[PDB]
Design an enzyme around this catalytic site. Sequence first.
Site, mmCIF file in Angstrom:
data_model
loop_
_atom_site.group_PDB
_atom_site.id
_atom_site.type_symbol
_atom_site.label_atom_id
_atom_site.label_comp_id
_atom_site.label_asym_id
_atom_site.label_seq_id
_atom_site.Cartn_x
_atom_site.Cartn_y
_atom_site.Cartn_z
ATOM 1 C CE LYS B 42 -88.376 30.717 -117.634
ATOM 2 N NZ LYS B 42 -88.504 31.654 -118.935
ATOM 3 C CB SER B 43 -84.535 34.215 -110.842
ATOM 4 O OG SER B 43 -83.978 32.864 -110.827
ATOM 5 C CB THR B 45 -84.937 38.183 -116.107
ATOM 6 O OG1 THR B 45 -84.238 36.958 -115.718
ATOM 7 C CG2 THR B 45 -83.612 39.233 -116.464
ATOM 8 C CG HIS B 97 -79.781 34.542 -117.665
ATOM 9 N ND1 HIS B 97 -80.638 34.966 -116.726
ATOM 10 C CD2 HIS B 97 -80.506 34.528 -118.872
ATOM 11 C CE1 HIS B 97 -82.009 35.359 -117.482
ATOM 12 N NE2 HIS B 97 -81.684 34.894 -118.488
ATOM 13 C CB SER B 127 -90.409 29.198 -114.135
ATOM 14 O OG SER B 127 -90.424 29.915 -115.135
ATOM 15 C CE1 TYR B 182 -91.393 35.917 -110.050
ATOM 16 C CE2 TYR B 182 -92.527 34.718 -108.060
ATOM 17 C CZ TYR B 182 -92.600 35.186 -109.487
ATOM 18 O OH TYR B 182 -93.669 35.185 -110.084
ATOM 19 C CG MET B 221 -95.528 42.950 -117.375
ATOM 20 S SD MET B 221 -93.937 42.574 -116.413
ATOM 21 C CE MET B 221 -92.723 42.072 -117.534
ATOM 22 N NE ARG B 234 -95.139 28.121 -115.390
ATOM 23 C CZ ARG B 234 -95.698 27.478 -114.284
ATOM 24 N NH1 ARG B 234 -96.778 26.796 -114.474
ATOM 25 N NH2 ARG B 234 -95.086 28.010 -113.075
ATOM 26 N N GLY B 236 -96.948 33.290 -112.752
ATOM 27 C CA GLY B 236 -96.529 34.564 -111.966
ATOM 28 C C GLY B 236 -96.804 34.342 -110.535
HETATM 29 N N1 LIG Z 1 -95.190 40.874 -113.750
HETATM 30 C C1 LIG Z 1 -94.671 39.579 -113.367
HETATM 31 N N2 LIG Z 1 -95.376 39.337 -112.273
HETATM 32 C C2 LIG Z 1 -95.288 37.994 -111.607
HETATM 33 N N3 LIG Z 1 -94.245 37.175 -112.393
HETATM 34 C C3 LIG Z 1 -93.844 37.276 -113.469
HETATM 35 C C4 LIG Z 1 -94.009 38.532 -114.072
HETATM 36 N N4 LIG Z 1 -93.383 38.703 -115.211
HETATM 37 C C5 LIG Z 1 -92.666 37.691 -115.273
HETATM 38 N N5 LIG Z 1 -92.989 36.902 -114.328
HETATM 39 C C6 LIG Z 1 -92.438 35.418 -114.122
HETATM 40 O O1 LIG Z 1 -90.931 35.081 -114.165
HETATM 41 C C7 LIG Z 1 -90.514 33.809 -114.647
HETATM 42 C C8 LIG Z 1 -89.823 34.196 -115.924
HETATM 43 O O2 LIG Z 1 -88.462 34.563 -115.463
HETATM 44 P P1 LIG Z 1 -87.545 35.293 -116.201
HETATM 45 O O3 LIG Z 1 -87.823 36.616 -116.539
HETATM 46 O O4 LIG Z 1 -86.435 35.379 -115.334
HETATM 47 O O5 LIG Z 1 -87.324 34.498 -117.688
HETATM 48 S S1 LIG Z 1 -86.044 34.433 -118.475
HETATM 49 O O6 LIG Z 1 -84.899 33.718 -117.657
HETATM 50 O O7 LIG Z 1 -85.419 35.653 -118.599
HETATM 51 O O8 LIG Z 1 -86.163 33.777 -119.927
HETATM 52 C C9 LIG Z 1 -92.099 33.453 -115.230
HETATM 53 O O9 LIG Z 1 -92.684 32.497 -113.987
HETATM 54 P P2 LIG Z 1 -93.549 31.221 -113.953
HETATM 55 O O10 LIG Z 1 -95.102 31.998 -114.039
HETATM 56 O O11 LIG Z 1 -93.581 30.924 -112.615
HETATM 57 O O12 LIG Z 1 -93.145 30.535 -115.196
HETATM 58 C C10 LIG Z 1 -93.112 34.837 -115.378
HETATM 59 O O13 LIG Z 1 -94.400 34.270 -115.418
#
Ligand SMILES: Nc1ncnc2c1ncn2[C@@H]1O[C@H](COP(=O)(O)OS(=O)(=O)O)[C@@H](OP(=O)(O)O)[C@H]1O
Lengths: 274, 272
Positions: B42-43, B45, B97, B127, B182, B221, B234, B236
């Site tokens: 959830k960082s 990825t 991870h 997250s 992030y 995305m 969710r 972002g």
């Molecule tokens: N394009 C883009 N821009 C901004 N933020 C983004 C983007 N893609 C993924 N995210 C946010 O990253 C969170 C998911 O983290 P991970 O991809 O590490 O999840 S996982 O561990 O691989 O299942 C989750 O964060 P939260 O929105 O804070 O829940 C995602 O919304």
Amino acid sequence: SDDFLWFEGIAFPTMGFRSETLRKVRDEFVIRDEDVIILTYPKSGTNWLAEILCLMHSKGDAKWIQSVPIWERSPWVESEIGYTALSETESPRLFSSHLPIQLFPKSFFSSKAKVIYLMRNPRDVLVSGYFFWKNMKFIKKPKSWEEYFEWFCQGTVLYGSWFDHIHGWMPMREEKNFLLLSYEELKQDTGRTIEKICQFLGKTLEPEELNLILKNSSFQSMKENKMSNYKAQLLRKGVSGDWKNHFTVAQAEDFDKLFQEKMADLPRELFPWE
Amino acid sequence: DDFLWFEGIAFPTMGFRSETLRKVRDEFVIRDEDVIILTYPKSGTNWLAEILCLMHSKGDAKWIQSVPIWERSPWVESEIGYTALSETESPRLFSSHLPIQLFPKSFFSSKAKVIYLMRNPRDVLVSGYFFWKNMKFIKKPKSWEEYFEWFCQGTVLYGSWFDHIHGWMPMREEKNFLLLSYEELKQDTGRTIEKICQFLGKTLEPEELNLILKNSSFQSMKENKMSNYAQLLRKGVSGDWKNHFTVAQAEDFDKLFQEKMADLPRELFPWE
Ligand SMILES: Nc1ncnc2c1ncn2[C@@H]1O[C@H](COP(=O)(O)OS(=O)(=O)O)[C@@H](OP(=O)(O)O)[C@H]1O
Ligand SMILES: Nc1ncnc2c1ncn2[C@@H]1O[C@H](COP(=O)(O)OS(=O)(=O)O)[C@@H](OP(=O)(O)O)[C@H]1O
Ligand SMILES: [K+]
Ligand SMILES: [K+]
């Protein structure tokens, strides 16, 4: 909004209250010089102070408070039930109101009746009302904690804005027949606060009566008394500072700035909380 | 509980095997040409994965729109990603991870490149809570306040955030290790993509950079089913923790963070 009764821009429940009675409270209700009145914004500690005053009257003895409901012992004057009970009660009367000052009986302001105004940190008030009211009929129920928080900050809640209530009533604070107390001081040194109440009402207590008044009005004892603690409880937790377990950091930040802005015109010294 | 436990670390019960996790650590062969994304879950990825896929295709969206993200950047420690990566031509791209003590041992005498992506653990907490809220094959928390306690204690998937960071941070001066947050990716997306290009030895034209920024935005995305597996994408943003931490939780977490992280330069963490 038709989930409240709206009267003079202030929200009341849609059962229990009649706009005719509210008008009469303002225009007609006769305040006697012997009346003792508790004034609070809702959820600031009204029932705690009603219990203390009842225990003063009964000298710490508990039979009466344990067999008559607190709402009969200290009627809520603007409510239908409170209004009619009181016009048939013999002096000296004890009762309470949550009315902001613009709705309070005119008759009061030229009388010698004694009022005790109890204030509480509105963050703790917000939490308290949230849990008490959140599943109750005849009010507007919030969809969420966040929504109720917004309403409260905007004053679209029962009895209107906390900030207005306080501004309305604060100009009375230097009057001889007005005692300004906080819930925080009452919680932190109950004995010293009950003594302030004594000076003000001109009552003296024996040491043993005082012990008993302190014992029977503490949170733990009142909680057991079903006459006073009327499926969400009136006596929920009974502390200061619970708002911390409920406000998000963002809500805390929003509220600090709304408070500093609304209350800028009053001495900061008035509000014993952070 | 409802986790698969391996070496004191919780994994989901579906899709993961103790024997695979053993081979991943002890046996799996890392190649000098591997590019590996390391995150505590959830960082961000999937954001980083999509960016690097887009760099590969010079900003063109057709690949990323027609092949699942988790197939373009497999999760090495899962059953599926382990097997798929054994049959992938170099240069491989993949994610993990794993904390350091579970990571393939052959990495450390290789020249593979890793990009470690860190996020404010408060935002990570929020997250994961929302994502793993309703979901079988892991243990569900009864409440927000319980999940919060778990995360603080490390009793969550992939273990303690504090240990993950502690384990991997001593690698950060290595030539083949890029440290990102992030936060800087969100605040300063072009600059960050430029740093990735520098680190991987790639160059990018302005038309390419724009396609990458368009096709890896949150919104773009979100609407793409190959990238959006409750939802992966969710909200972002950074700082959403402020809408969920109570004031008392914030006080506890500050105290905990400051205590756990006092041995590392504060400059490492671009928040609080
Ligand atoms: N394009 C883009 N821009 C901004 N933020 C983004 C983007 N893609 C993924 N995210 C946010 O990253 C969170 C998911 O983290 P991970 O991809 O590490 O999840 S996982 O561990 O691989 O299942 C989750 O964060 P939260 O929105 O804070 O829940 C995602 O919304
Ligand atoms: N004895 C004693 N000690 C400490 N605290 C007490 C006591 N009695 C009542 N309370 C707390 O006061 C809150 C209820 O306020 P009100 O009586 O004003 O409610 S009401 O408007 O009259 O319906 C409500 O506060 P919260 O516990 O914060 O919800 C009660 O628990
Ligand atoms: K006074
Ligand atoms: K480096």
